[PDB]
Design a protein around this ligand. Sequence first.
Ligand SMILES: Cc1cc2nc3c(=O)[nH]c(=O)nc-3n(C[C@H](O)[C@H](O)[C@H](O)COP(=O)(O)OP(=O)(O)OC[C@H]3O[C@@H](n4cnc5c(N)ncnc54)[C@H](O)[C@@H]3O)c2cc1C
Ligand SMILES: Cc1cc2nc3c(=O)[nH]c(=O)nc-3n(C[C@H](O)[C@H](O)[C@H](O)COP(=O)(O)OP(=O)(O)OC[C@H]3O[C@@H](n4cnc5c(N)ncnc54)[C@H](O)[C@@H]3O)c2cc1C
Ligand SMILES: CCCCCCCCCCCCO[C@@H]1O[C@H](CO)[C@@H](O[C@H]2O[C@H](CO)[C@@H](O)[C@H](O)[C@H]2O)[C@H](O)[C@H]1O
Ligand SMILES: CCCCCCCCCCCCO[C@@H]1O[C@H](CO)[C@@H](O[C@H]2O[C@H](CO)[C@@H](O)[C@H](O)[C@H]2O)[C@H](O)[C@H]1O
Ligand SMILES: CCCCCCCCCCC1=C(C)C(=O)C(OC)=C(OC)C1=O
Ligand SMILES: CCCCCCCCCCC1=C(C)C(=O)C(OC)=C(OC)C1=O
Ligand SMILES: [S]
Ligand SMILES: [S]
Ligand SMILES: [S]
Ligand SMILES: [S]
Ligand SMILES: [S]
Ligand SMILES: [S]
Ligand SMILES: [S]
Ligand SMILES: [S]
Lengths: 421, 421
Amino acid sequence: MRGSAHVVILGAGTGGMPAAYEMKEALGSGHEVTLISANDYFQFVPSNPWVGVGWKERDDIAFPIRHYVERKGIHFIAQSAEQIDAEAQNITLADGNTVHYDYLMIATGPKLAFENVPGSDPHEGPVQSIATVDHAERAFAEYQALLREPGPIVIGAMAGASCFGPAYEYAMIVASDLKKRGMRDKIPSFTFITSEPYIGHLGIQGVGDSKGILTKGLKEEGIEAYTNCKVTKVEDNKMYVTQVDEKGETIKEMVLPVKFGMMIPAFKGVPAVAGVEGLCNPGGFVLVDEHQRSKKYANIFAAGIAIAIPPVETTPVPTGAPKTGYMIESMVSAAVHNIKADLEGRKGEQTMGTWNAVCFADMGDRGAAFIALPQLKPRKVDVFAYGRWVHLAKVAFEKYFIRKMKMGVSEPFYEKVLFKM
Amino acid sequence: MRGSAHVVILGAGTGGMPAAYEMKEALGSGHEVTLISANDYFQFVPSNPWVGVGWKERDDIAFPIRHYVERKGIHFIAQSAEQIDAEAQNITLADGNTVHYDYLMIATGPKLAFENVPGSDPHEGPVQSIATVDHAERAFAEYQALLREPGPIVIGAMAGASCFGPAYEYAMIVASDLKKRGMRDKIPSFTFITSEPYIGHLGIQGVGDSKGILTKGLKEEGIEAYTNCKVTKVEDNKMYVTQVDEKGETIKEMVLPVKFGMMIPAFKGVPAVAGVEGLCNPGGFVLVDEHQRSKKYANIFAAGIAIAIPPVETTPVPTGAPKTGYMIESMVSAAVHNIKADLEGRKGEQTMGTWNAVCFADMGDRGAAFIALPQLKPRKVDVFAYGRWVHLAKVAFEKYFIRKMKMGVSEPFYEKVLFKM
Ligand SMILES: Cc1cc2nc3c(=O)[nH]c(=O)nc-3n(C[C@H](O)[C@H](O)[C@H](O)COP(=O)(O)OP(=O)(O)OC[C@H]3O[C@@H](n4cnc5c(N)ncnc54)[C@H](O)[C@@H]3O)c2cc1C
Ligand SMILES: Cc1cc2nc3c(=O)[nH]c(=O)nc-3n(C[C@H](O)[C@H](O)[C@H](O)COP(=O)(O)OP(=O)(O)OC[C@H]3O[C@@H](n4cnc5c(N)ncnc54)[C@H](O)[C@@H]3O)c2cc1C
Ligand SMILES: CCCCCCCCCCCCO[C@@H]1O[C@H](CO)[C@@H](O[C@H]2O[C@H](CO)[C@@H](O)[C@H](O)[C@H]2O)[C@H](O)[C@H]1O
Ligand SMILES: CCCCCCCCCCCCO[C@@H]1O[C@H](CO)[C@@H](O[C@H]2O[C@H](CO)[C@@H](O)[C@H](O)[C@H]2O)[C@H](O)[C@H]1O
Ligand SMILES: CCCCCCCCCCC1=C(C)C(=O)C(OC)=C(OC)C1=O
Ligand SMILES: CCCCCCCCCCC1=C(C)C(=O)C(OC)=C(OC)C1=O
Ligand SMILES: [S]
Ligand SMILES: [S]
Ligand SMILES: [S]
Ligand SMILES: [S]
Ligand SMILES: [S]
Ligand SMILES: [S]
Ligand SMILES: [S]
Ligand SMILES: [S]
């Protein structure tokens, strides 16, 4: 309402949860902050690969949202948005109720585009997913069925994927768990299929010695690896793969039987968001300016995987650059600051800052991590690390983030940097 | 004087220069700030290895101090301190004049302890030094004499050394320059001798894959490498080396002819500082608390290589941990803050923060760098990087630091971190 703006945050994930707390803290008691999300619980996404191999349980990485945001004055609606009318500024929920907003912050993350590859939906065949805790529990169930009846394994990343780290991670811990169960030698073949132009490209043209280190890691585990691949269909428990060369010409086709599989799908924008006229690019990603404001609607902002970021490279098989946690939080922080500014007359000048990608993968006793910025080479920081300490950092960060999501965030978030001061 | 404290900074190096500017900025017009140093010019130390192989000239890395600090209100005395009387609070200069102080900040850096190894002084034999621009110009002159009359090369680090990075760097660029001159095949032998327990220990128990990467680098260049070595004497152009095992027992002795050599010496405290009764440990390093205040004299502070830092490890051949640029600046910043606090009644609570080591080495087209913290394992950050980007960062940092040393420093120094914002 006038003088008491209603700010709605769509999606309670890595960007949306923090955004709700920060929005409420920034606006105070004079404004209404409503968080709307498809699930009633928060999940810590980077832990999903561990759930998928049974090293972690749902209860370790997820928790009910309601009580935590409500005690901060935030209204919570555990309902999926089905439709967004940007003119009337109304959101239609799954149950048919309508929520009005004065400002909308879209943090809806990715639609997992299984439809790009017929048969690839986790519910339609042997190719599973670890993108969400629901999918990862199902992936683990299929992993156990593999343990009962050993057969070929295929893990990797589809054409259009932008999130390659977790595929390597999942391949490695699957291999590790198989060894730990004395079951590794029962596996007929273990294949890694990726749309990357080379191993360890990671959608960012490589970082540090990612290529050499990931190549050697897969070889150490007896995992045969194919790059420049796109999967055309999954059918009769077989994966039809087409491999191209630098100029997109087919250099071979393959048919791989799959008893147990996991391919990271391409990400698109979720339907309620993509469905908003003039809001998104053809992928369903929100077109925003440097202030996280939609280029079409001045009272719509976006952060997280939901926003569109221009490519800088074009690979033989389509691939995308990842949108990772630290950059997401900078997007959120910026959106909250600029919305508050709007409420108080000013144009917020805050931006996301420099593009960066940061990723941590835990293999059990040791981890791998990278940091790359900015997007294009030569970079200011281009590092790849491996060791027990990376594992310890992942464990520590997970504990911290989950606690923050329960206790609330003021907050210039990453002051997890005073481990210096 | 009372109500107008006189603050003296001893030594105009990596810590002392910034300290003088920051002290003056922090105290203002009501207090006198005097900078006293042995040389009338500032030099950028990390560039010395390049001078030593002729890739850089003195004029690229050094400049006259006087006009730059004087225009900030800082008094400059280009004279070495010979004696410090901590009771009377008087400093005796080389020319016999005496300077009184109310507060003294010691930033005198290392005494290069050539006396530990008879014959090892650059002026007494073939073993040269790249620790200072004076030494590096002499090292380069000897390098040219090697070019005229090829003979064996020995590069490395003495027992008690704490600064290993530059030895590896110097070995690598010497090898590289020899190749570029079509002179590499004329060299009878190229040996690397270190007190480290293994290649790439770096006095910090290794960082990232420093061991594997430095080992392979030396092998690539046809440099034969010996660890756990101490040099007992240099005599008749021969280096007498003793190699021990884990328990300090001699496993062999060697006599290496040397036409051209460069060994990083052990560092001690400079004589004027070490000579102050009760100020220093037996190495001549100032004993300070976490606030950079001498444990004996409350109006004496210290920062940089001059302070004592307890060992965390004890190697078969004595070695030390390095004290590098970012930690030095945090020491300086702390000392300045706590001295100002003292002037205004309070006890400054500011500390150096977490121990860390950061180092950059430029090989020409590509560089190697590391970051390690804290000192003891398992670390929070333990990274080793290599690439063209490391080279670009070194080049950039040198330009920045030198410019800052001319323009002055307010200043919470490392905001060379807003390459993010
Ligand atoms: C397996 C995996 C591992 C990852 N590892 C890392 C890592 O190590 N480091 C790192 O920095 N990043 C990592 N990422 C990338 C990225 O940080 C995460 O994907 C992150 O969760 C993205 O945050 P988000 O807020 O944009 O989307 P999400 O966290 O997915 O949140 C989106 C939210 O919106 C909700 N939603 C969607 N549609 C609707 C709708 N119509 N109505 C209401 N709610 C809706 C969803 O339920 C969800 O709650 C990982 C990604 C995955 C998939
Ligand atoms: C070859 C080399 C490479 C290095 N590379 C790196 C690097 O890559 N990264 C990094 O972070 N660190 C590096 N270091 C380590 C460290 O950062 C430097 O040694 C740094 O210069 C130390 O700063 P300081 O202020 O303690 O001493 P210094 O910079 O040596 O300054 C001491 C000053 O005190 C003066 N002085 C000494 N005695 C007296 C006296 N009696 N009276 C008056 N003045 C006196 C000296 O002339 C000098 O000006 C390098 C060291 C060396 C030697
Ligand atoms: C985070 C995003 C990236 C993708 C996710 C993770 C992918 C899986 C990683 C597989 C790597 C396994 O392979 C491992 O690599 C490193 C090489 O750097 C080796 O380790 C080597 O360097 C490390 C330091 O970095 C040293 O501590 C170690 O002593 C040395 O041997 C290991 O001996 C090898 O076993
Ligand atoms: C900064 C303090 C440390 C000491 C100072 C410097 C010591 C000298 C460094 C010698 C290293 C030379 O050896 C070099 O190492 C790296 C391995 O990581 C290799 O490079 C490898 O990893 C890098 C990334 O980190 C990739 O960009 C590269 O494509 C890959 O081949 C090079 O092919 C090899 O030539
Ligand atoms: C340029 C700054 C990078 C941040 C590095 C320090 C600590 C944070 C690690 C990165 C990270 C972030 C930011 C993060 O938000 C996240 O969760 C989605 C992770 O997964 C575990 C991460 O690993
Ligand atoms: C933990 C923070 C580390 C700082 C990294 C970012 C940029 C600075 C590089 C380190 C460095 C410092 C601090 C530094 O003071 C210095 O000069 C003595 C260098 O030599 C070139 C350095 O390489
Ligand atoms: S997935
Ligand atoms: S990702
Ligand atoms: S990734
Ligand atoms: S990631
Ligand atoms: S040296
Ligand atoms: S050093
Ligand atoms: S070093
Ligand atoms: S260094």
